[model samples]
Target chain A: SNAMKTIRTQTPLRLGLAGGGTDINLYCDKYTGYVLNATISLYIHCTLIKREDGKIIFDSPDTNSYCEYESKEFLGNDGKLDIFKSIYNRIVKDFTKKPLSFSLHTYSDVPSGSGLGGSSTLVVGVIKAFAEWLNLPLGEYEIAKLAYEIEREDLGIVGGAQDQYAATFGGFNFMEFYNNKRVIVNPLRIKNWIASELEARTVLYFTNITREAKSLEAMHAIKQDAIKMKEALFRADFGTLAQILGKSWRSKKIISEIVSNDELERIYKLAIDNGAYSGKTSGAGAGGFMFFFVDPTKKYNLIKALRKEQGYVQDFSFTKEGVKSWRI
Target chain B: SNAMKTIRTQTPLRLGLAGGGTDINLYCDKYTGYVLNATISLYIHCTLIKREDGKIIFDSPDTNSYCEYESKEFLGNDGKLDIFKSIYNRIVKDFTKKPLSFSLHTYSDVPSGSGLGGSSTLVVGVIKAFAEWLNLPLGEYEIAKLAYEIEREDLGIVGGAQDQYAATFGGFNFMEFYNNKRVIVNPLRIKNWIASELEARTVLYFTNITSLEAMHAIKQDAIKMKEALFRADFGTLAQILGKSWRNDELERIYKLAIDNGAYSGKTSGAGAGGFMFFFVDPTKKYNLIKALRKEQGYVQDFSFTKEGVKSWRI
Candidate 1:
């Protein structure tokens, strides 16, 4: 049951300003609030072609890796295709059925572990494509949620829900979590000027440090600290608190039991030494890029300072759209 | 300069049954989708006690730690009180010159991570408390967006917007996210039995996993996948994605992603293994729970997940 069709789409990365840690539940136990501060549009793209023999081929042009497996039996290959196979296996094992098959070529705008939700967004897009390919009666929330659940939670990653949401829903909006089983998504009522200003000043840079993101984040307990930071979101009236949370995001390195090192500490201090107000480990910050927020006017200085350290900086704008796909 | 009354309230943890990640712009690049989720009363509580001295103390029952800092001087410390201190600093730097000091505490029935929007719920409750504490004229959407921007997105957490919407608005609902600017939230038209089943069978468990959840989903890439997913969101069929998209009030989701709910169900976190979704009628909850526990061998046991959002300060 292989039908042929071509698909293409793109998604963005996010820059955080505050409340990086403490969103993890473990940290939230001790600290009651969280805050995040960042923005941007780092993109991801995909093209899919259906094959008749149920051949599933996966490729990431950026990484220059490719693998192909029949839909009938694809597993344990240890490649990007593994994800689709995993989902397929789980769905089959859980529901006792195989849905369909296709070949997908993936590309991302940001480097791997660039401190943006790069991999998750890519997976989310694939899940969406599969859903659309099947003509499944799913919704936007269902699509995003399923993409997240399957690739992240079910797949066993450690993180909060912001990037997946941003990657899927797209926009300058806020997502609130509550006990009654709901997510409140409200767009910021910022004036067009504020929105435009946020767009104009946003910058995304990559460290291109290829390594395991989770192990390092765990070493510092940055993942656990996110829960503690959750409060700043529910209580935004305490903006002053959010300002200081920037430091909390930086301090997370101290708790990470995995990637704690002098270099990590030095980088945390380096941003401050330069003109960055507050810097925190972005994504799974072991050797990956760290993010900093400064006045748009000071962008050149920040870039020059970061460039001295061999970092890559790129201008990014806030995207109102998360993932976009089309068929031809 | 402190002239605000202390307002104490509680909100609960929120869970997602379906449509977890594709709720934002990155995903809209491909498809329109919907989220089926609920808000419960497990809460984060805040106390707005006035302090003659310029000091702020933040505490949470779960963590059992407290941070006390002077107004604006909190950031330079070990950054141990970093998250709270950031908020304190922002409040002082932006709006209120008032020397308002306060204590913040949180209590939750569910464990952290486990795939539920526990932290987002706390943030929303805090936002409401601050609104009540200072009488700021922030609306529901405003409060939700600001909380998410400040907490989740700004922090670069790998989640979508379902938790915030569910927690702030309350009750069983369907949320639709499209490429256009607006989010359409509608009450889930649940069958009485279906609602009762969801109420009985839904459970939140703790994974005790500590990592960036989105990081583990290395199957593909995050941003790219979201864009691929978003293409379907704004098409002419965008309205048909979630509740408006499915309109499956009676029909159950079979042979697809969701199992047996009003429409569909999925996990609620940034992916790498947290919470999952279940939408069975109350009569079928026992079987579903058994299936999840026995056949599926899921970590969560059948415990009646709480209802609505509740918050208090002690």
Candidate 2:
């Protein structure tokens, strides 16, 4: 009897900072779209097992979703966990010569599409597992591109490119996307004091809502604002960062009406009224999680006030490494 | 027991004339990329059948590839039939609430990756079939965008946008892409004589090579040349279209077109082994085809098509 082996991979979830919407084709393709984001300690994990019986099983314990196929050839979109299917189809078709019989399990610390790059990060993890299994010649750039393609191209989902890149490269990055569709990820060598200070002063408030939005002119304005945010981030000017975030929030609602609501507005006031200096909704706004910058000592005060107002606060730390996979 | 029903959809393949590379995010997002292309008679066809046994089967007789999934959830990339799986995953996830058991078969008239927008058309055909089955509210623009996302975004395939739009809208079009990622398709209303003359004089030559190339300055060149061609100034247009910076088989084809009195020529797809075409005098059309045939290139006579993607019950 041969030994059974398993391959496991993990990719960190990311937080969209100054420029979130700029990564999408609507903004990034016409003009430069910039986003400043960092990967968090929270991760999306994937495990793959080879089976001799030619049956394929996919399990996600977090969502309580499980799927099975008689063999690799038996996979299709039947509507559940299609993200896994999408990655499997792409990797199997382009990389391997023979059909692969395996079981895949995915787990995410955060909920799907909750402003955190949960979906893209999960895809990055899946791609990592397959690349490791096949020993595919893929570096960070290749991995992120493949993941973005699966979600944006394969699934016809409209989103930006930052999530995939952030998940793959990890840590703090100043990403620039040009009209030519070329994306450059510049990993910021953040100062030790700045990184620590930002971490301590930031607080995440989960509004418990997943969001999608619309429009073109407003999108262009957000793109312009993103560039400004990037400059502020580069200068390490917290005052300017706060100012840009507030201005960005105004333009963001213009780009998509669904990005803001009375509840979110109330929470925004609550944090501002407490000790927070400035903040904005994370991801595409409207709901999900929002992060605010406060004085290091006042972060607890903002968190306490938000908790009293029925907000869900999630804790996270910055990570410098991206997706990692190996056999076990 | 449930009744088995079949849904069939077909989308036409297209030939890229001038301004080919701009639709890719690499170019269109920075500078304005423009393309002039028209649909042809060749098509990608798809058939979907509801299965009673709760099994999923995908067959592409042209490529002699067949795959079976026990159920929809079991389908994925297995190093075969990737395009099918890509679209299946998208449609099933966003459109359907339940896992569907069905047999899907796809076939195309052209060779795979021949540079004639073969793969994109195939995806367009599949998307059409699924949209019809689910009665999804999608127009031509939506269909083209969906097809493009599947190939360029979903699959992480590197390519331009002309193919997907060409397949969906059909006919001849002058498409413009702005840096904001907005694509506007302006269908060109050609005169009957011009359309007929262009068709009678043009010949598609298969060099048996597929092509991939690089970027930027050439993109700007393409935009200027396209404007000249669009104005129907044959002499100036021929001079502009006849030049090639890369010294591959494409240059050979371009030189041949010029020597033979063809007004102009360009590669139909990316470059290399796939297909190339030339604009000639209606009187000299036979000469150009004969010249290409002498070199053992596969020559096909085709006309510009008016209708785009169409679906029907067969």
Candidate 3:
């Protein structure tokens, strides 16, 4: 009456606290790039069920599609559920050389283009599930490395590297990215009061629009904000943190014209007018979640003020555990 | 050397947090029943491997017993591993109609008599392995039903119906058992703040057994406990903890634990022997544990497990 084995994996999505564009090309290649990020309570979840038949199944409810094909080296990509299909193609080609039959189902707390590192984290979830299913001895860095190689390189998604590392290495991390493809993730220990204060004052307001993650120096200034943000965060210098946030946003908006749209400016202005000291659209921000740092005592007023818009507000805590995979 | 189909399954044992004797034959037949129980970290594990030859093997190190059989038309059960074999017989007759050829290896974190709902949960675990093996489209409710039928109906085990459902559902459940042979398990969704306090304060130790106002009181108390869980009212829950007390030894064992530091105490399951659990303040949790470990019995530290019975093939 029984069939095959199953492995499930969950990888947390992240908030790009600071240092977004500094981790990418040109700037990172010239000068070192620094990033400050933290993973939230939400996750990119995966379930891998080993199949007996010579078929690979990509069951994705997010895409509202289900597709199955004979197990092969390459499962072609034509728009829908391509993230999973491409990963399946890569995993089989690289590790399992021989065709492996299984159904891989993926789900995320946030959608891909909402830019909370959903797509890359989803890739990490799949890689962890496959590694657990195949009993591959890959470290956390290795897993993130493979996730980066698959999503950014192979799939040709134009995104930065910090998301992969953030999803893999959870909690508050101050990361360093060298031009020569070197990333050193330095996990910062958040003081208990700072953690509580941060969670209390922050509002995750979804812009209800699809977008992507975006880059480089003016890269110098953005990279400088990344460095200064880490210091202010550690010192719990609330005033400095707000000042740096505003300065960082000022610099980020100038990096590209497409970065700032009318709706984006409206949300930013609305938040600042309400109670928020400093705020920016999360990830690539043309239309996505707007991350804000408001006055801790007045966050509720800011929250209700934002609720007047079309988007929704999400409350979350910092998750210490990164990506975890286990058999069931 | 070992190229055979292998499958593994794990089912968590349950803590009868509230309601005990109300779901049995006599009481349940007249007034229906209610039991509020939660599954914990302790588990009954099962490993099954298909054999080419038509043979059935039951290997249980927990019982320190192993038995083998040639694939007879029917494998009858006697004493050792009866729970393991009984499910196999029913799985064949009702579902397969053909003898299954596999060696079932099972291990339990707790023993049979110590009553963290070990015995009945084992039945659920075995049935799950078979369901996984044959690809049976058995939902959670169906699996619980089959386990109850095999253990209580066919085997005539002297117990209640709540254990089967608790092990099968694997979380905090407020269960309703109707006299009309229907059961409904309402899974309790406790908020994080409340759930964490419950985990931090509750203590379980082997030493255990239960009673009756006491029996009727138990039913009402369980209903109250269900409300307390929903309300996140820990103080009321502790106040209505355990009123079903009679046996002198059970009372004495509970007193010994509570006096050390526990705010509330109760004997689990059979009450004649086995485990005694307590609920104390977080500061006194370890005090109660140290006292239980030093004085008469050892404690089982468990976190609430979310999933119920799961099986996978390798």
Candidate 4:
């Protein structure tokens, strides 16, 4: 309740531009998986301060979730803010090898499990704050690597590494994930004009459902589109980018089980009919946020059409820096 | 004509700023490691006296060892001066492929069991001396690498890689250790004013050394400590020191020093009993030292050194 040695970290949520499942363990391990993603302005902000009283807290102001506990190296396995506990537990279990008492308060601009890499991004942010607080030396790669492991490996959650990588190295990135923990993050320097144009042409819509991978031939096409998408953005080819995105979405759903539904298909077609060029669900599909590409001149027209659907259009911009943590 | 008969070499000991165990075989190879450590005024010095008789004598006055050899196939790896023997045989085997008669003697500034990298520092020192006697132009990388091989590989000694580099580079170095025995030491040049300030606020106390981590975190601190020193942010550096040491009887003494005005403190080297240092304003340096001295710990005044391993003949 009082101001003390506080560490603050802010991590950007990601927009999985293309090739979403390519970074998953089995997928990326055997065959080379690729992902094209960008971090958006929407962020998860975290603050942490040590407590001397042997009580640890993981609180969320945005979600109104409050979890408190006695400090332990392994804080229980219960699903009550266990991600935060595991992050703390992993840090302590790895570094100090002893439980440390501290309070962490966080807020997310987007809802949990919203497929914006929210969980992965929060891990990056939370770990980063702990790094600052504990004076752990974690660079961008290390932060992303640890976050990727904490979720997929440690927490036993099934996910790709793009979200964590994008959250750590915010910017438009072309990511390549090879088997056995190798990831190459290529940050495509978006031309200022192109960046703004892309932002203008992009319409981020939320369907109020947070649901959270697919086929061999279709997976290959999704991977190919990611490469094509990167090339398109590099050469300022929005038309080809949208066209590839449409193909990528189709490819993504072909090898999937319920990543798509009739309601989503109606919205996708409605946007296309309203002059929206191309875009797909920016995540695992089905629900969560759907991103749309439209001609900037007719952006509002597409937005007006989306208003008739079961989702509301939300706005965001590309963020340059990844997760950042500092202390005061 | 007069010829070189004796060779002398001295290597500085190191303070592990962070990433203390990252360079160890399993840790660095698996996860990679980054470390920040500074060589200090303490030293492991070697003196080699060439003899006409084909006899080998390895000695460590500090370690209370004196082993004599008769140009055998290999120097026996007994408890007596084993690291010294390893260094000698390693150099002879690697280059000469033969043994020469010389009495290698050592004098150390810190205790034999001290965590200020006493063993590795001694290895670098002895190797440096042998290099001078053999007239080999082994540079920093060559010397440090050989020192590491002499211990962990040749002698089966257990440890990380920072001590050898600190003894070789002799400065504030940010080290990167990777798989396959790869290590990069980035020597940092501290600003004079900042250096002066750091030296003014520093206190090196000798506490009995005590105690790993599940290592990336330890390894990570090297980078943090490097940045802290780069920015002259002693406050963060102190916090890092606190986080790095993972100590009991050590804890009680730790509280005493912090209570005595030290901003923060950590056990030096592999902590349990050896050297522990504190970051205290010069204003509180006496107070911390005063409290520490009463706890069977002695304080030593030290300055940062920028010369790694060096040898000369007379």
Candidate 5:
């Protein structure tokens, strides 16, 4: 009874950089997929409180939604808190043998499907909290893979591997995906100055548009550009890196008909005129956040110009730590 | 150069079984795909005769297409005999130091996109013909991998590895796919009696619809069915296979098969239509075949082949 106190866990969200769509199956299998992504300060916060009535309560403050399961095995995807229920059911099946009672609640700084890897980060948060509660020995890969499997395999959610790994490992990682689900996450040792400079010049704006499910053709082009961009990042060629962001945006648009529209293009043109070197819609492009890299001197001009266009602007820094959880 | 007087090669087509979409990257990388496929008597035939004027001519009678390349390097995807051009260019790049003058003519018993691995088989035929003319020491894996790359990576044609491997190894094979593009084609040692019995009970029908490019959703379901079928656990396999072909015409055909006493039926490839097959009782095979024929569908006459891709001296 003493061990059934309160447990809290937080998992950082990620910004997918070069090689977004490349981490998926078709491209990754034949040519191998790679992604250069970094985690941000935004996080999914999960809190779990033990219950004694043999009931499981799941809530998300961000969505203002609630769901209850009499037991873990009883959870269903009735469209309310499916993400939470998916993770909970998986943990119950794999980690804990018994249906313990706990009320798990989650909230995120970023909205769901914002393309900041919120869904996957939320999954990691729940898993970390469960691991802390159960005292399970799970490493970063195990946690990432379990989260990936729950979402992709069990829940039938279509996505790639970068989000889970980025959330689990934290910091900047250059991930290599091989066939048969083998991934090697290499943490980049960026000089702090470069990281800060990139952070300062970068701007994130929410366009309030959510992406639809991606198409296979569009996926091919996305990864093709990402692989090339990864090369530019590795060489520390910031200008080429900026150029590829523009190139990747073009490729991302090919992924679907709605990834870009007339209004979004006008906004992109405005950003470029205001010293923005390159920009792309975060996630699958149909809209959510449009991030840009500008000259650090003109960061304010870029922000001001984007604000005039009416969008939510958020400031974030790179996070060096991944999922962290503890119990009291 | 008289040794290359007449280089003739033939590569057989294939029937996919047990494993279908599992050989693709997304499915295979996660679950480790498996395919049990057998080569059929249908083939793509190629003939190569050296020319003295330094001109390369490619022809495919099945499509009534023809093209001439001054040199292999100059060949492009001009949409006429592109498969021939693709294989010829690859052979020049990897297998030969220079493009020799030759007229390469090809023809297939089955149409392209028939889901019987016609396209890949044609590529295999060209490669085999080149191997014969150039005396390249290429094995079955080498031939299959080279053909796969030529069509897939070089030509940007999306397909699975089972086709190329089936043509290269011939006969029956149970293919295993691993990460890093590793494929092992384990030849099945089915006794002659079992092979004959399976063949006598099997029927193939052309649905007259070429499949559209595959999507990931269909790909996932295809792999699940293939995996279930691989376990010889028929119950789940039937359900998985059933959901994969929900289109009205395919469903109708499947129903006909069941109505005519088929033990099981499945649509080949990604299944917008192409070819559909059924495993009927040997005694009832004729009835199912007659019923399918009554629907005005073309019934293909084919048997299993034990020979892989090979060049013949004519």
Candidate 6:
């Protein structure tokens, strides 16, 4: 392994359109479905390097904390709550005696829990770095799935496969999910100019709240809901959520007691009232980020109104490259 | 989850004319090359059914023993090395959940370890089952990538990206694996008759000697060697392998082994030789397969394989 060199990767943000929150418990479980999405240039950097120590460490620039583990000989069954340990326990089971120490750090263009798939971007970057450094010799799909598996399954997080895939594969993709396991990513032949234009006008905003992934943790085990939603997405009937989400949000209010405040509801109506298409909450319900697909001409007006409401608008662009790495 | 259901998949078998085994490590790491492949009628099948009790089991028609788990919770790490346990341990770590406690039985039309990607087909089938059951909302790349990951990363297998992509994203394809992970799968826009006719004259025979994958696995860590060799091999690989192969068996085998600039290839299996199937490469090979069958009297036919990850309600 002395010949092994370090590989570091940086990935960009992916903008989700039409099927945002629906990709969770509601859309994919019931029916074979597909999603339409594109990648954005707002980025996350991941660094992977060889170390003399036989340890694995995970770091987050935002969290400002590092989790380190000794070689397999020292790892414990009751290891502290750490991302590195979480991934290690889920995958390697125990570390090998091989000198495999590396550090992973996260730097994102968008804030955490901002409705954009910033976290998924980080996961994809790390997977890519590992794939390169370790020389796993995997393909694009293999890299993307590792990212998806680690974040959504191993980590027990609430999210869809789009972000990790977009960051890893990096293209204007039309993905079709059938049954539970059948997924096809068809990269649409959209003109590069169209793709470029879309990325230029894109704006991401944070609602100043960190949407808790645990809010949907219980639903992760709720197979029925995921199935039903999957069926709708397969049927291409997003309208089913128009009333269903309304009712569900109301019930969620009863459970968490923060269903609807006046400003959020007004913002929702502003999109509908304006030439903008329908809008929805990004991740968790309480309030994190909201996405509005406005006509390119009306984007300035929409941004002005949101800013007037004390909201901060973030400008971002699309990326055709998923997670990319370089040698030192 | 009761609303979810599991369905079986029929995965295809592929053959490489020129650049078969070179895609994984050597060629990819160096030249970042391109490859073309086609699917034949050969396939693997799985039967899916729900478990009356809270358990999941796998019974393979080929491999010995049936694997079983009592419940979804038990499907996780138990520090064991059972077949389904090894599979489940990897599966759970990737996709999450035992969404449905189902019974699965596997059957394949082709023999195992026969140069074709039989193992990747199994991974593709299992992932298809989970996606169908959980409706995790995926697409082709997601399905193909999940299958690829389990094999390349989780299984630590030595191979290229083309096999899974070939089977899952079926039809004749021109695949580009460039720098920075740009995988472009362009379905070769040829007349259907050309593909079908090529299949018709093609003949697959079991040489019972070598497995193609074995040759590929050995060359995985050496990318530069592969690229340099392939640059020369791609020029005459078609003639040396396709024509010379069907003529004199032992001589072709020797030539294939020592063929200069050849990326990698071998008969699949644990023997002196293995399955030797030939697909029509160009107009020359097509006429040759037909001439041997029509004029010289030989076995000639084709098998049309369906796409991977097919499902229907029970």
The C-alpha stretches of model 1 lying farther than 4 A from their native spots are: A1-4, A20-39, A73-80, A89-101, A152-154, A158-160, A173-190, A199-204, A208-274, A284-287, B1-314
Which is the leading candidate under TM-score?
3
| Candidate 2 chain B weakest lDDT stretch, 10 residues | B1-10
Q: Report how far off residue A157 is in candidate 2 (Å).
A: 2.7
Task: Please list the residue runs of candidate 5 whose C-alpha ends up more than 4 Å from where it truly belongs after superposition.
Answer: A1-4, A20-29, A71-73, A209-260, A284-287, B1-314
User: Model 2: what TM-score for its first chain?
Assistant: 0.83
Report fnat for all candidates as fractions from 0 to 1.
0.00, 0.00, 0.00, 0.00, 0.00, 0.00
Candidate 3's DockQ: 0.01
Question: Per-residue alpha-carbon lDDT of model 6 for B144-256, expressed as tens digits?
Answer: 87677666654564335567787787766656554425566766544443343334324555554345454354333233323423343333333344432335564464343
Please provide, for model 1 over B114-138, each residue's C-alpha lDDT reduced to its tens digit, 9 standing for 90 to 100: 5557667777776676666666777
Candidate 6 lDDT, tens digit per residue, A1-328?
A: 1123545566767665533122333543543444556776566656566776777776664444566766553345453434455454433532233435666655554555555677677767776666676666678777777767777765676434766777778766656554545666766555443443333233355566432332455433333343454454344333452323333333343223223445555556665565455445656443366665554434545565666555566544444666666543
Per-residue lDDT, model 2, residue A142, is: 92
Best by lDDT: 3
lDDT of 3 by residue, A163-187 (tens): 8888888888888767635667888
Report, for candidate 3, the interface RMSD.
Answer: 28.5
Rank candidates by TM-score, best first.
3, 4, 2, 5, 1, 6
- The docking quality of candidate 2, as DockQ, is 0.01
Better lDDT candidate (1, 4): 4
lDDT of 2 by residue, B1-314 (tens): 11226566768888766664444456434655666778986666677877778787888866768888877543667888887887887877777856778888766656676777887888888898888777888998899888888887555553346678889888888776676366678877664434543564576778876533544665656666656546654445555545542377678776886787776665655567777777665434555666776784677655566778876432
CA RMSD (A), model 6:
24.6
Candidate 5 has which clashing residue pairs, if any? A19-A226, A180-B29, A209-A287, A218-A255
